[PDB]
Amino acid sequence: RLPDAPTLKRMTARFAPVDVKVDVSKLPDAEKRALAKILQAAKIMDPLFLSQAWAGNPTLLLDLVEDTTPLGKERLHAFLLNKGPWSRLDEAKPFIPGVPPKPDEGNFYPAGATKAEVEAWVKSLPEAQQHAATGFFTTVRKGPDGKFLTVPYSVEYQGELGMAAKLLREAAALTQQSTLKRFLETRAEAFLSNDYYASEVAWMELDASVEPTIGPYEVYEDGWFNYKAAFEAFIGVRDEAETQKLAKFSAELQELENNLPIEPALRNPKLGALAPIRVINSLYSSGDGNRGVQTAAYNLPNDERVAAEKGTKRVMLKNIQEAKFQRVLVPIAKVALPAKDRKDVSFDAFFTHILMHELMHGLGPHNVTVAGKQTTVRQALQASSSAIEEAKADISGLWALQRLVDKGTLDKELQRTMYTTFLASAFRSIRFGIDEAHGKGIALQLNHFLDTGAVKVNADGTFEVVPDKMQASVTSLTNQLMSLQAKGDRAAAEELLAKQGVVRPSVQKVLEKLKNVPVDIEPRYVTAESLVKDFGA
Amino acid sequence: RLPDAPTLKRMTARFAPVDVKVDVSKLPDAEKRALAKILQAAKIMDPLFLSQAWAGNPTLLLDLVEDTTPLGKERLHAFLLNKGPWSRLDEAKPFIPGVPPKPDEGNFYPAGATKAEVEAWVKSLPEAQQHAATGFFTTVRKGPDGKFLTVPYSVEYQGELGMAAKLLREAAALTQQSTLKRFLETRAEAFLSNDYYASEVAWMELDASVEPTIGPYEVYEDGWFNYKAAFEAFIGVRDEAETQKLAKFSAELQELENNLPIEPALRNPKLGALAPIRVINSLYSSGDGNRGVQTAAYNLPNDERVAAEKGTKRVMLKNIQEAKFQRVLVPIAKVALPAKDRKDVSFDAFFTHILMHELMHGLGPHNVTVAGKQTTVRQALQASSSAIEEAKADISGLWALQRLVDKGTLDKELQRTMYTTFLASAFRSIRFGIDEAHGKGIALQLNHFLDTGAVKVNADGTFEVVPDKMQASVTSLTNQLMSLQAKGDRAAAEELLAKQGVVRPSVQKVLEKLKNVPVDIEPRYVTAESLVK
Ligand SMILES: [Zn+2]
Ligand SMILES: [Zn+2]
């Protein structure tokens, strides 16, 4: 059951340590001082997320810290890396004695509750109370009279969020960048109002050298319903050259939406008008932004009301992606692919596809009407929504990448590298774990490719793309996933993930030859540490 | 201006490390097993209290766990000992860089709020709702509609309290001590219902080898109002024989109340009926029960309704008292007192006075009516209540000790040792610091003694009791403090604390000569850690 110090050191070493140094010599003094305050606010996301993941985390940490044995130090490292006593890579197997199984409910729901109890209470509420109860930024608690009630995040986490708000406000007073001041002010305010709409708009309107993402966003930690958002931060320095090169993609979105291989009625004829894309070098992440496998890029807001009315912002973490490529993808390709396809794995393809993935998160069905009630694909699919959506983004990303190479917007060299790089990366992602949204979604795609003849298994164990079947296979899964989403068909989604969201034995064979290769990275944010020491008061 | 590693290590060393070992060999197996589960629940009060004291604590703790230089390690130890970045012995001076001055409000009140703002909001509520807002077991937060609201503790700390409730319910199933089962079950329920009355009664009715005190109790950490309770635990093993020696005191309570040296109308004509007294050897403490200076004993509940209707329970932590007396009081007595008076220091006098102190917390004014409004002494005096109530308990404890010696209930030997032992302890408590309730209250007493000539300073700078002036001095201060509480006179309380709650030059000179003596103790709960593995 429980690993010894060497077994645990080894498990933790699957996250290759990387010192994440980011050049900040180009920033004026004032912007470094603002950045230090921002960093200080960001740090607060770490204990916030820790206690979202599990209410017993703070208590355990105090136990872990007293044990300065070598085993104890490995346990503390593992705990901090995984934000809890469960191995995120190994289907949440505990590595600390005396802990229970990882609760799907995290610390978002009533003490003692079951999923069934929560659902039954929600369904007894009037419409408006249901939407409040099932929203991103409320917890659910048992009140003194024993009945369930909704608590706004601004109230749940007030102490911590007040301190974060104060630091963002101090940052806002130091920066000379107007769009950053505005974001910082409005996000400080949102923390305490619980209304994120204005501050998300300000966030999308950012055009500054410092690109802070901070607040409650992703729902992967709510394993019951995928309703409740987790606190996170990513704080980066804008890479202007790379950002400018991508601006042209925003203009391609409405056309892609207009041509989605689904029933025409299901298409969005008017996407939100904001589609900023920013390339940044990240110099800090926290909360849900620093646990297990590192985030490479993202598309926010997730909140469909803001996204429908305004659009969404895609962020690429270039330096993180270069580390993943270098330290994981290239070594994987050497084992997973036949010798002749290894030259067709390129960072340009990897990067580009990640971009297409974030672009396509913002396209396809989101707000939908199911059985006479207006809802959202996410709300309809509940705990199945995350895996399905990641699959959709990945597969429709390829669909869109092909379209944009065809029209000349993307380089023709991507015709040679796009699918083979994706195939190597399928092995990369599936090693995140079959219960992890990206991992599960990639297993479903890869199985789809095998079942349609778009990838094949060779006799040396390696896998390879079969080009003449790839494009139609990509298009079919795009159609399947989006149509299931549009229907709000939770039962179909569950069945598909149960049947196809698995590691087939040919894939497991490759995974056994990759035990010597890291699964992802462990950032040490050396520049962020020094900024806060040098500029922080 | 912050301390370096060796300086901070020396600071922390003023809490003398004590291995706290408790003999559990006479507990049956099932009771040891329930004790473990109880100890698991108790551990939860540590992070609960950390978060109550400062919203910045969990974030700071993660920074400190990562600095493993020798400075880092001393910073972590001091952080855990003081339950925050502020030195509880040095007027809350920070010992961590980048930390603000300790917030009086802790993490009980709304983000960005001032004390004046909370006062105005409360005053603006319907009388019905003011009680909820100024009660022990709600936090106050700004809601999204902009306005302040009340959050029950059972909602505010839900996750952690659910885990604590689960563990107490597990303990209840293991133990075969019926009354312990009842307490553990009702307390588990209380954590989630936020109504502690029934479980307090069950806690007072306990008759078991294991004495678990666990829940939200003392208000010292609310430096604005003294409204809000902090989570704590004290887990111990009953000393049967010592407990039986004290059973007789319960019967003395109403009689003591009946004779308090105040306007007779102010006396309570009928105390709550319950007055259990327990002597226990503590084997674990947490939350507000393990920060800085250790608690020696206590009187709970603080909830004046339960107390008035049902009574209160007094618990003496004998092993902790023994360590304080040996390691601290005794060495102080050899400096602070003239050589002739030193033989009149005794553990019996020290122990006895602490008991009187705990008895007298439960007597005197509590529920009072101030300007047409039913209230409590505590809520009327706000941030001044704690130091006034501690001075009351100490000085009225001497008044009661003297009365019980005069009656024959306590032995005459205490006539020789009670005042002189208390004088040495006064130097003990004032070293906790002038901003700490016990220390400020003891300053107020020692200075009253100086002013009435009940204690004098000798030419060699030592202090000594003047016996023929002491009894009357104790009585007038008892009268002063109780009358002040009865009137709910917060202005007078503030004025008395500011004027008399200070370390005078003669005392400071003694304190200088005490630089080598520990201030208190740091428990290492060796038996508790064994039970939980
Ligand atoms: Zn995605
Ligand atoms: Zn007291």
Note which residues in 361-400 of chain B have CB less than 8 A from chain A: none
What are the backbone angles phi and psi of residue B463, rounded to the nearest 5°? -110, 150
What distance in Å separates the CA atoms of residue B511 and residue A509, rounded to the nearest whole number?
74
What stretch of H or E contains A138? strand A138-142
Cα A383 to its chain centre, rounded Å, is 15
| Ligand number nearest to the C-alpha of B388 | 2
Query: What CATH number has the domain spanning B158-531?
Result: 3.30.540.30
Q: Are strands B15-19 and A455-457 parallel, antiparallel or unpaired?
A: unpaired
| Ligand number nearest to the C-alpha of A390 | 1
| Ligand number nearest to the C-alpha of B390 | 2
Tokens describing residue A252: 């391609």
Tell me the DSSP string of B72-121.
HHHHHHHHHHHTSSEETTTTTEE-STT--SPPTTTTSS-TT--HHHHHHH
CA dihedral A426, A430, A435, A437 (to 10 degrees): -30
Q: Are strands B277-287 and B313-317 parallel, antiparallel or unpaired?
A: parallel
Q: Would you mind telling me the total number of residues written for chain B in this entry?
A: 533
* Greatest extent of chain B over all pairs of C-alpha atoms, in Å: 69
Question: How close, in Å, is residue A111 to chain B by CA atoms?
Answer: 5
User: Is the CB of B192 inside 8 Å of chain A's CB atoms?
Assistant: yes
CA dihedral B41, B46, B51, B52 (to 10 degrees): 90
Tokens describing residue A434: 């079959």
Residue with tokens 């890479």: A239
Cα B211 to its chain centre, rounded Å, is 17
Cα-to-centroid distance, A157 and ligand 1 (Å):
27
From the list B228, B161, B160, B149, the residue with the least C-alpha distance to B190 is: B161
What distance in Å separates the CA atoms of residue B376 and residue B367, rounded to the nearest whole number?
4
| CB nearest to B44's CB, from A59, A193, A194 | A59
Residue B528 to residues A56, A99, B249, Cα–Cα distance (Å): 19, 19, 31
CB distance A61 to B76 below 8 Å: no
What stretch of H or E contains B213? strand B210-216
What's B364-432 look like in SS3? CCCEEEECCEEEEHHHHHHHHHHHHHHHHHHHHHHHHHHHHHHHCCCCCCHHHHHHHHHHHHHHHHHCC
Asked if the Cβ–Cβ distance from B46 to A56 is below 8 Å, we say no
Cα B470 to its chain centre, rounded Å, is 26
What distance in Å separates the CA atoms of residue B57 and residue B50, rounded to the nearest whole number?
6
The approach used to solve this structure was X-ray
Counting other chains too, the contacts that A463-472 makes at CB distance below 8 Å and 24 or more residues apart are A463/A336, A463/A337, A463/A423, A463/A427, A463/A506, A463/A510, A464/A337, A464/A338, A464/A341, A464/A420, A464/A423, A465/A341, A465/A419, A465/A420, A465/A423, A467/A419, A470/A419, A471/A402
A267: DSSP letter: S
Sequence-separated (6 or more) residues with CB below 8 Å from residue B173: none
Cα-to-centroid distance, B393 and ligand 2 (Å):
6
A13: DSSP letter: T
What distance in Å separates the CA atoms of residue A220 and residue A226, rounded to the nearest whole number?
6
CB distance B275 to B312 below 8 Å: yes
Q: Are strands B231-238 and B277-287 parallel, antiparallel or unpaired?
A: antiparallel
Coil, strand or helix at A219: coil
Tokens describing residue B77: 């130890």
| CB nearest to B111's CB, from A151, A152, A162 | A162
| CB nearest to B144's CB, from A65, A80, A194 | A194
| CB nearest to A144's CB, from B143, B154, B163 | B154
What distance in Å separates the CA atoms of residue A165 and residue A183, rounded to the nearest whole number?
12
From the list A396, A411, A291, A391, the residue with the least C-alpha distance to A347 is: A411
Cα-to-centroid distance, B470 and ligand 1 (Å):
78
Cα-to-centroid distance, B474 and ligand 2 (Å):
17
What's A139-207 look like in SS3? EEEECCCCCEEEEEHHHHCHHHHHHHHHHHHHHHHHCCCHHHHHHHHHHHHHHHHCCCHHHHHHHHCCC
| CB nearest to B155's CB, from A80, A151, A166 | A151
Q: Is A21 exposed, middle or buried (0-12, 13-18, 19+ CB in 10 A)?
A: middle
Sequence-separated (6 or more) residues with CB below 8 Å from residue B355: B246, B249, B277, B297, B314, B316, B397
Q: Which residues are registered as beta bridge partners of A370?
A: A373
What are the backbone angles phi and psi of residue A367, rounded to the nearest 5°? -85, 125
Question: How close, in Å, is residue A228 to chain B by CA atoms?
Answer: 16
Residue A385 to residues A369, B82, B96, Cα–Cα distance (Å): 16, 46, 45
What's B125-187 look like in SS3? CCHHHHHHHCCCCEEEEECCCCCEEEEEHHHHCHHHHHHHHHHHHHHHHHCCCHHHHHHHHHH
Note which residues in 81-120 of chain A have CB less than 8 A from chain B: 107, 110-112
Tokens describing residue A153: 């995040």
From the list A110, A442, A475, A62, the residue with the least C-alpha distance to B76 is: A62
What distance in Å separates the CA atoms of residue B110 and residue B134, rounded to the nearest whole number?
13
Asked if the Cβ–Cβ distance from B159 to A59 is below 8 Å, we say no
What distance in Å separates the CA atoms of residue A394 and residue A389, rounded to the nearest whole number?
9
What stretch of H or E contains B214? strand B210-216
CA dihedral B276, B280, B282, B286 (to 10 degrees): 0
Note which residues in 29-48 of chain A have CB less than 8 A from chain B: 43-44, 46-47
Asked if the Cβ–Cβ distance from A144 to B193 is below 8 Å, we say yes
Query: What is the amino acid identity at position A362?
Result: G
Query: What is the amino acid identity at position A274?
Result: L
What distance in Å separates the CA atoms of residue B234 and residue A88, rounded to the nearest whole number?
36
Query: What is the amino acid identity at position B193?
Result: S
Q: Which residues are registered as beta bridge partners of A17?
A: A522
Query: What is the amino acid identity at position A84?
Result: G
From the list B467, B425, B461, the residue with the least C-alpha distance to B446 is: B425
CB distance A397 to A504 below 8 Å: no
Asked if the Cβ–Cβ distance from B98 to A56 is below 8 Å, we say no
Cα A519 to its chain centre, rounded Å, is 16
Query: What is the amino acid identity at position B387?
Result: A
CA dihedral A43, A44, A49, A54 (to 10 degrees): 120
Residue with tokens 């563990």: B167
Coil, strand or helix at B441: helix
Asked if the Cβ–Cβ distance from B155 to A141 is below 8 Å, we say yes
Q: What Rg value do the Cα atoms of chain A yield, rounded?
A: 22
Search chain A and give the residue with CA nearest B58.
A47
Tokens describing residue A162: 């007040």
B210: DSSP letter: E
From the list B302, B230, B160, B262, the residue with the least C-alpha distance to B483 is: B262
Note which residues in 156-185 of chain B have CB less than 8 A from chain A: 158-163, 165
Coil, strand or helix at A223: coil
Asked if the Cβ–Cβ distance from B144 to A63 is below 8 Å, we say no
Question: How close, in Å, is residue B181 to chain A by CA atoms?
Answer: 20
Query: What is the amino acid identity at position B263?
Result: E
Counting other chains too, the contacts that A335-340 makes at CB distance below 8 Å and 24 or more residues apart are A335/A462, A335/A510, A335/A513, A335/A514, A335/A517, A336/A423, A336/A424, A336/A427, A336/A462, A336/A463, A336/A510, A336/A514, A337/A420, A337/A423, A337/A424, A337/A462, A337/A463, A337/A464, A338/A458, A338/A460, A338/A462, A338/A464
Question: How close, in Å, is residue B58 to chain A by CA atoms?
Answer: 6
Cα B250 to its chain centre, rounded Å, is 21
CB distance B520 to B432 below 8 Å: yes
Q: Which residues are registered as beta bridge partners of B368?
A: B375
What's B272-338 look like in SS3? CCECCEEEEEEEEEEECCCCCCCCCEEEECCCHHHHHHHECEEEEEHHHHHHHHHHHHHHHHHHHCC
Query: What is the amino acid identity at position A408?
Result: G
Asked if the Cβ–Cβ distance from B98 to A159 is below 8 Å, we say no
Residues of B within 8 A of A111 (CB-CB) are 158-159, 161-163, 165, 192
The neighbour count for residue B84, using CB atoms within 10 Å, is 29
| Ligand number nearest to the C-alpha of B297 | 2
User: Is the CB of A65 inside 8 Å of chain B's CB atoms?
Assistant: yes
Residue A394 to residues A365, A468, B38, B458, Cα–Cα distance (Å): 15, 20, 50, 86
The neighbour count for residue B190, using CB atoms within 10 Å, is 25
Which residue intervals of A311-384 are DSSP H helices?
318-324, 330-336, 347-361, 377-381
| Ligand number nearest to the C-alpha of B391 | 2
Classify each residue of A88-103 as buried b or exposed e, where b means 16 or more C-beta atoms within 10 Å of its C-beta.
bbeebbbbbeeeeebb
Asked if the Cβ–Cβ distance from B158 to A195 is below 8 Å, we say no
| For residue B301, cis peptide bond before it (omega within 30 degrees of 0) | yes
Tell me the DSSP string of B486-520.
HHT-HHHHHHHHHHHSS--HHHHHHHHTTTTS-SE
Sequence-separated (6 or more) residues with CB below 8 Å from residue A387: A437, A440, A441, A444, A497, A501
From the list B285, B315, B40, the residue with the least C-alpha distance to B168 is: B40
CB distance A438 to A462 below 8 Å: no
Sequence-separated (6 or more) residues with CB below 8 Å from residue B298: B213, B234, B314, B315, B358
Residue with tokens 């470094």: A32
Residue with tokens 């947490």: B286
Q: Phi-psi bin for A199: left (phi > 0), alpha (psi -120 to 50), beta?
A: alpha
Residue with tokens 């050396």: A526
Q: Phi-psi bin for B146: left (phi > 0), alpha (psi -120 to 50), beta?
A: left
Question: How close, in Å, is residue B164 to chain A by CA atoms?
Answer: 10
What stretch of H or E contains A280? strand A277-287
From the list B327, B321, B330, B378, the residue with the least C-alpha distance to B353 is: B321
What distance in Å separates the CA atoms of residue A27 and residue A237, rounded to the nearest whole number?
9
What distance in Å separates the CA atoms of residue A97 and residue A156, rounded to the nearest whole number?
30
What distance in Å separates the CA atoms of residue B51 and residue B49, rounded to the nearest whole number?
5
| Ligand number nearest to the C-alpha of A437 | 1
Tokens describing residue B300: 């709970």
Residue A328 to residues A14, A239, A321, A336, A483, Cα–Cα distance (Å): 10, 23, 10, 12, 34
User: Is the CB of B236 inside 8 Å of chain A's CB atoms?
Assistant: no
From the list A485, A488, A321, A317, the residue with the least C-alpha distance to A396 is: A485
Cα-to-centroid distance, B377 and ligand 2 (Å):
15
Tokens describing residue A121: 């209470």
A2: DSSP letter: -
B353: DSSP letter: H
The neighbour count for residue A526, using CB atoms within 10 Å, is 14
CB distance B237 to B222 below 8 Å: no
Q: Phi-psi bin for A30: left (phi > 0), alpha (psi -120 to 50), beta?
A: alpha
Tokens describing residue B377: 């002494």
Tokens describing residue A336: 């997973």
What distance in Å separates the CA atoms of residue B431 and residue A358, rounded to the nearest whole number?
62
What distance in Å separates the CA atoms of residue B114 and residue B109, rounded to the nearest whole number?
9
What distance in Å separates the CA atoms of residue B473 and residue B490, rounded to the nearest whole number?
23
Search chain A and give the residue with CA nearest B139.
A155
Residue with tokens 């005490």: B514
CB distance A19 to A103 below 8 Å: no
